[PDB]
Design a protein around this nucleic acid. Structure first.
Ligand SMILES: [Zn+2]
Lengths: 48, 197, 49, 136, 52, 189
RNA sequence: AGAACUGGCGAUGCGGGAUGAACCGAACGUAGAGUUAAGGUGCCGGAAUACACGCUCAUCAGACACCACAAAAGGUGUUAG
RNA sequence: GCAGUCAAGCGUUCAUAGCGACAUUGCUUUUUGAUUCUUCGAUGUCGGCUCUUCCUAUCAUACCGAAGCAGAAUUCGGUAAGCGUUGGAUUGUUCACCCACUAAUAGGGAACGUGAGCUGGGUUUAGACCGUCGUGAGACAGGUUAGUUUUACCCUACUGAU
């Protein structure tokens, strides 16, 4: 996680009062590089 | 008489097993009970369900982690019935209940080892034909078990891996009977037949 | 007297044992949680200026 | 809530609770309205109900035309001072809390509205919009 | 428009019944002994109301 | 009292062979074929002819014997359905609002949907059981015919229909609408 | 709460009724063998998952008197009459 | 306080849709009473505030049945206590009455829950005033006003923590 910001977008929720209107919403930004795979692990079913 | 006993629990009744187990294990015999999801119990399903839902009701109010631990697995329902029959609060009940090893399905070690049956608890012999009986897997699942669909996927592999063994053995011994039946017409056997062998 | 930012009557008598259900002080935060149905509004490219 | 409401509203910051004494814009002789209740307004222990813009209240006049006072009457609040948030983002507020006398069917008693009026009331109560001269 | 050749059919499943005075349960018109256990399989029945 | 022997018997018209092993009936015929499980009942079966079968219970005592004739009818209904077949003729009824019924292939199997059940918008669908064929009358276009071999499938499906096309929160003495069975017969006679 | 006759608890342990001042059995020197009381023999629990004729299957079964509760009225559920 | 059984009748006709007298069977311990076993080398005694949990004899909400159910609205009943069940004037009040919203404004228990948790309006010490009683000191379950509310660092429980 990094932090938050504020945006604007036109709506497509039809029949609402704010259809074809714009709004303001708050979003979180999360920094998200590439992970790298190093392994694989195998799980199997048991009665436990 | 054998050092360890392996009890197939199919078509058995719970409280009529556990009074044999709880005495044979208090007298010094090691017992394992296997295929406990195939156990049977008197009474209709709804009735034996309510007799569990009136157990889940009983938990220590001020903190329920202190109270009656309602186990949902058949291996543990049977153990409950036995723990009740045993003075588990002493070093004799404790020592006994460590002579016991209960399972669902038949794991490998007790797969290739012979199984037995307690006739004074078989539903077949005991119960009237026409009475309703309830199966512990359906019950456990209905009160919050999870691993029913696994045991059936494993025990079937057990069965198809066992049926081939049985066919192998049978198609071996049908000739042992022939080559010992071809050898029973001598004096060695006409003399034993008088002794009773 | 003896505080206001608290609870009175943490329990009645004969249960005689304070309950798991009653409000009591302790840690706040550093708990694990899973919120759901969070929509995505942009998936970001790092090589873009 | 829908006792005369044409449409349905968004949540607005609940400004003025009961006990509030807000002006009266209409030309019905009144001067202030004492809120005694709110339509909607669910229950919680020790919580006193509140009124937002566009909400109906039930009210009691304290100053104006003794023909009116000493009785309850429905009312409609059309300005409030609590900064509230519009979906377009901005926080707006008025300089005074003010209301209107009304009947349960959402109609009015007066012929005008002395002052500005909130879009969040006027879209909803249509008989207020026809008698308003200004909207925000 | 129900054409009473068919109104008779709808009434076989709706209004040709008998009701317990003790549990208010739909029972058939020919039967005694309310099938529900909470009543005690009683015999106090009546016909269902069809005229006024 | 506990009796000694209560036995019923089951005729068998030709073309039919009734195979039993461990209380699992299997019947065949011109129309088709059928099976049934009766492990939950204690009952025997013997073959005195290819033309009939003898079913028997022993001491019993007034509870097993009531299931005896029941079993007898079940097997007899089965033979009847695999020799002739069953036909259930349901019919529509309404006052103002017609019921618009059709068959529809959903993602899985067939269904039968009904619309305008008293002006409702809920398109209420019903599965078709596997043992059922299904059609509409043509002499009058306001019926429907379920049909098959197994009555406990056909009739259960018809009841599944007329149980969902039932009005709620209204006077049923007045709102005698929906669909209802009208005739039970076969598809040979 | 208050009287009559007797037996007890009090002042009395012991085996049984899970537990209990009074109930059942039975009254106590220290010990050993045998036999029983009342109560019990699925397991906890020592002792028959004994034998026999039947009744009951309860979606709040029922199970050691005192004792720790249960009625009027009903049921084609079943059994016998 | 709650419920049930007969059912004479009410119920435009229609005992039992709903109700239902004369009688009669019980349940409850949230009433009041009776009793006096425990507690007088002290179990802190009204109400409210706060807070949790439980019960069902369900006010509402869910699915159903029945009506003297056309619809709408209502009543009777059932499974069901999962979820909720208010803001305020007057009163110390329990209790009560009204205004108002509401889906609804249901009843009850937990040492008549809860005072080392609060308050201390009331009651129940001492000061004082009136009325009535009494020769008088003084009485009143009659009214009025003012009147010290102590301690947890222990064990357990609980919340969190190594
Ligand atoms: Zn009934």
């Amino acid at each position: 996680k990094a932090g938050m910001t504020t945006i604007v977008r036109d709506l497509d929720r039809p029949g609402s009062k704010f259809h074809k209107r714009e709004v303001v919403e708050a979003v979180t930004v999360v920094d998200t590089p590439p992970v790298v795979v190093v392994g694989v692990v195998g799980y199997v079913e048991t009665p436990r | 008489s054998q050092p360890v006993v392996v009890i197939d629990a199919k078509d058995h009744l719970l409280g009529r097993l556990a009074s044999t187990i709880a005495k044979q294990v208090l007298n010094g015999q090691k017992i394992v009970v296997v295929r406990a999801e195939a156990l049977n119990i008197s009474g209709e399903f709804f009735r034996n369900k309510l007799k569990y839902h009136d157990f889940l009701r009983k938990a220590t109010a001020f903190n329920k982690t202190r109270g009656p631990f309602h186990f949902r697995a058949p291996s543990r329902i049977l153990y409950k019935a036995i723990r009740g029959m045993v003075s588990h609060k002493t070093a004799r009940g404790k020592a006994a209940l460590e002579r016991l090893k209960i399972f669902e399905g038949i794991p490998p070690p007790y797969d290739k080892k012979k199984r037995v049956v307690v006739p004074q608890a078989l539903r077949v012999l005991r119960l009237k034909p026409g009475r309703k009986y309830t199966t512990l897997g359906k019950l456990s699942t209905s009160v919050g078990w999870k691993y029913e669909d696994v045991v059936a996927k494993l025990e079937d592999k057990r069965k198809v891996r066992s049926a081939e063994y049985y066919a192998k053995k049978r198609a071996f011994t049908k000739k042992v009977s022939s080559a010992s039946a071809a050898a029973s017409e001598s004096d060695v056997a006409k003399q034993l037949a008088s002794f009773g062998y | 007297h003896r505080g206001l930012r608290k609870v009175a009557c943490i329990g009645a008598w004969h249960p005689a044992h304070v309950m798991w259900s009653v409000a009591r002080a302790g840690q706040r935060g550093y708990h694990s949680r899973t919120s759901i149905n969070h929509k995505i509004y942009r998936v970001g490219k790092g090589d873009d200026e | 809530s829908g006792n005369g409401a044409q449409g349905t509203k968004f949540r607005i910051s609940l400004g003025l609770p009961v006990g509030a004494i807000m002006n009266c814009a209409d030309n019905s002789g009144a001067r202030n309205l004492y809120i005694i209740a709110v339509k909607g307004s669910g229950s919680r222990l020790n919580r006193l109900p509140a009124a937002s813009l566009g909400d109906m209240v039930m009210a009691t006049v304290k100053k104006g035309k003794p023909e009116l006072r000493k009785k309850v009457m429905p009312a409609i609040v059309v300005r409030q001072a609590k900064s509230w948030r519009r979906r377009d983002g901005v926080f707006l507020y008025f300089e005074d809390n003010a209301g209107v006398i009304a009947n349960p069917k959402g109609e009015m008693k007066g012929s005008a509205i002395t002052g500005p009026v909130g879009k969040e009331c006027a879209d909803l109560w249509p008989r207020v919009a026809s008698n308003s001269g200004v909207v925000v | 428009i129900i054409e009473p050749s068919l109104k008779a059919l709808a009434s076989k499943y709706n209004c040709d019944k008998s009701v317990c005075r003790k549990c208010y349960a739909r029972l058939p018109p020919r039967a005694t002994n309310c099938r529900k256990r909470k009543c005690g399989h009683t015999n106090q029945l009546r016909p269902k109301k069809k005229l006024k | 009292m506990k009796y000694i022997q209560t036995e019923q018997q089951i005729e068998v018209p030709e073309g039919v062979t009734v195979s039993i092993k461990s209380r699992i009936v299997k019947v065949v015929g011109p129309r088709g074929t059928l099976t049934k499980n009766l492990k939950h009942i204690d009952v025997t079966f013997t073959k005195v002819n290819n033309q009939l079968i003898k079913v028997a219970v022993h001491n019993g005592g007034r509870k097993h014997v009531a299931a005896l004739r029941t079993v007898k009818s079940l097997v007899d209904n089965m033979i009847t359905g695999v020799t002739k077949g069953y036909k259930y003729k349901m019919r529509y009824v309404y006052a103002h609002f017609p019921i618009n019924v059709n068959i529809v292939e959903k993602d899985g199997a067939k269904f039968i949907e009904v619309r305008n059940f008293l002006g409702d918008k809920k398109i209420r669908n019903v599965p078709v059981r596997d043992g059922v064929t299904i059609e509409f009358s043509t002499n009058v276009k306001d019926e429907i015919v379920l049909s098959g071999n197994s009555v406990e499938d056909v009739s259960q499906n018809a009841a599944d229909l007329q149980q969902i096309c039932r009005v709620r929160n209204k006077d049923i003495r007045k709102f005698l609408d929906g669909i209802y069975v009208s005739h039970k017969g076969f598809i040979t006679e």
